[PDB]
């Protein structure tokens, strides 16, 4: 039931937050934590990276294997209503803080003046430096990632992860 | 635990949907079901009504008692994460269909091109003619209303009620 060390090892300091290695070549993070004005990520020049961004979701596909130690894992666009996920929060000190969250609706929501395609959930807290941490859940014997931490209410108990673009009938559109 | 007949009696056919008597003078409904081009509601000329509208939430305060048989009850701006509500759906045939829903985040969400301030929830379905039906929950021995039905996902299991305007620290802003 608990996230294994290898899964934690995918959570990586990045910009003003974190991101997550989905596979040896694919890294996801929250758009607002991506460093501005740089010419490279992880030592790779931007022209060698396929950079996809939609709202608060960012995905990099590097041309070379950056984490060849990892298997690929499944990235999905959010998860069903009511799914219990874990937000794999690393702190700068090194502390690991997995937070349980029961997920709600996928929607495009106005957050601080911007429209954000994401999924809200209820914590069962986060701090601003936690953005980019992955929302994961276990499916059978494997873990699935379905979002990256993007926002929280000032109370704390509501959180939002950014999710990949895509329409579908289970989401509010 | 079940909604009493008097509570159901507050649910009232209105426009292309329904609305709800909060008190003898106050009626709430969903903005998009309000009839267009009319000069009166419930026989009262518009100038005798205080009509408040914010997004998909509409409130009328009539100058005279329209339902003097009713007590006032509490209207709140949505409810806490995880609250189980009941959507008091009447159908045109007369059927009553209370639907249980576990509520999620209060947010401003894009729905069919419009921004809607509301609260999403998971059904524990609705049809388009159900808009305006109240979302209620029981608090002690009394019932509280906290939204009016506004939208549902094409799957059905996610619903949205419009809620009153107002900012606060438990909502996504
Ligand atoms: Na939080
Ligand atoms: Na429904």
Swiss-Prot record, chains A, B:
Q: Where in the sequence is the active site?
A: 32, 56, 131
**Description of how activity is regulated:** Inhibited by the chemical compound K36/GC376, which covalently binds to the nucleophilic cysteine residue. Inhibited by various macrocyclic inhibitors.
- Bilayer-crossing regions: none
Phenotype for residue 131 to A: Complete loss of 3CLpro activity
Summarizing the annotation, the consequence of altering residue 173 to Q is: No effect on 3CLpro activity
Q: Which reaction(s) are listed as its catalytic activity?
A: Endopeptidase with a preference for cleavage when the P1 position is occupied by Glu-|-Xaa and the P1' position is occupied by Gly-|-Yaa
Query: In this protein, which residues make up the domain named Peptidase C37?
Result: 3-173
Q: Which domain of life is it from?
A: Viruses
| SUBUNIT field | Homodimer. Monomer; in solution.
**Could you tell me what this protein does?**
Processes the polyprotein. 3CLpro-RdRp is first released by autocleavage, then all other proteins are cleaved. May cleave host polyadenylate-binding protein thereby inhibiting cellular translation.
Q: What is this protein called?
A: 3C-like protease
Give the organism, scientific name: Norovirus (strain Human/NoV/United States/Norwalk/1968/GI) (Hu/NV/NV/1968/US)
Complete protein: which residues are present? 1101 to 1281 of 1789
């Amino acid at each position: 039931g608990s996230a294994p060390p290898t899964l934690w090892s995918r959570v990586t300091k990045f910009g003003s937050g974190w991101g997550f290695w989905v596979s040896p070549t694919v890294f996801i993070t929250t758009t607002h934590v991506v460093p501005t004005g740089v010419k490279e990520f992880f030592g790779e020049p931007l022209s060698s990276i396929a950079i996809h961004q939609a709202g608060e979701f960012t995905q990099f596909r590097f041309s070379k294997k950056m984490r060849p130690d990892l298997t690929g894992m499944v990235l999905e666009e959010g998860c069903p209503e009511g799914t219990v996920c874990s937000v794999l929060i690393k702190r700068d000190s090194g502390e690991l803080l997995p937070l349980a969250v029961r997920m709600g609706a996928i929607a495009s929501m106005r957050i601080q003046g911007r429209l954000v395609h994401g999924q809200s959930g209820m914590l069962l807290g986060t701090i601003p430096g936690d953005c980019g941490a992955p929302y994961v859940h276990k499916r059978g014997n494997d873990w699935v990632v379905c979002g990256v931490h993007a926002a929280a209410t000032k109370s704390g108990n509501t959180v939002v992860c950014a999710v990949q673009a895509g329409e579908g009938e289970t989401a509010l559109e």
